[PDB]
Design a protein around this ligand. Structure first.
Ligand code: ZN
Length: 262
């Protein structure tokens, strides 16, 4: 659309940010969209999983839906890289129209509560909306305990173009040469996500690159386990599931291409 329309939407979303920031400050400022967004994000990140105002949710949803759909990529417009069911796509996972995306969660399962942390959990929760945290809190409440490694739980995607978010907890990697045990645990994450998708009759799922951070699984070995586990699953089951390997960097892109090049 026009630059003019773009500037009006920006103005509206800055006003929505100010609104949401004010609510979170008062329940218990800067000028640029960039600075407002980081202020909002930090407040959202650290907020305990308690009920919100329904007016808050109306404003939040208007903002997040708008932001997430400004430049949507539809999986139907992508072409497979291997067979007819495996894709590698460079881009923002919160802007991909697809039945499910996979979130690398933590055991507390409420998302990232580290203000402004650069991790995929933070990104997915903050773009989807607070409902994802609230729904995860209810999953944990009904379960009676925090979430183990290598499992999968589904929530709605709310403001994401993705219909659902599949949440899995991966292993922490504290030793340089990744142990066999941790390799098996990562594979088990992939397998649980794939099975959950098929169980709920989803047509497609996207996995993300591991975000770089302390004790994150090394990218190289991660890609190899991802590809190996997905390919074994699709062979052994004759699943019609389509799988997308999402990457962000040019380097991660080439990495996954190689891993699929046999
Ligand atoms: Zn985080």
């Amino acid at each position: 659309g026009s630059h003019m329309a773009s500037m009006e939407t920006l103005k509206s979303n800055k006003a929505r940010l100010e609104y949401l920031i004010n609510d979170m400050r008062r329940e218990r400022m800067p000028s640029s969209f960039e600075d407002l967004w980081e202020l909002y994000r930090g407040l959202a990140n650290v907020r305990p999983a308690l009920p919100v105002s329904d007016e808050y949710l109306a404003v939040q949803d208007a903002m997040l839906s708008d932001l997430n759909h400004q430049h949507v990529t539809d999986l139907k417009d992508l072409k497979p890289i291997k067979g007819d069911n495996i894709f590698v796509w460079q881009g923002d996972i919160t802007t991909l129209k697809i039945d499910a995306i996979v979130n690398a969660a933590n055991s507390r399962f409420l998302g990232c509560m580290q203000a402004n942390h650069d991790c995929i959990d933070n990104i997915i929760h903050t773009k989807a909306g607070v409902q994802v945290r609230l729904d995860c809190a209810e999953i944990i409440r009904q379960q009676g305990r925090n979430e183990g490694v290598g499992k999968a739980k589904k929530t709605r995607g709310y403001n994401l173009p993705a219909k659902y978010i599949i949440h899995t907890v991966g292993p922490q990697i504290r030793r340089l040469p990744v142990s066999k045990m941790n390799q098996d645990l990562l594979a088990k994450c992939y397998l649980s996500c794939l099975k959950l998708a098929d169980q709920h009759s989803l047509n497609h799922v996207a996995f993300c690159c591991i975000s770089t951070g302390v004790f994150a699984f090394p990218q190289d070995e991660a890609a190899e386990i991802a590809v190996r586990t997905v390919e074994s699953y699709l062979k052994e089951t004759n699943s019609t599931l389509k799988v997308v390997f999402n990457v962000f960097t040019d380097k991660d892109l080439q990495l996954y291409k190689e891993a699929l090049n046999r």
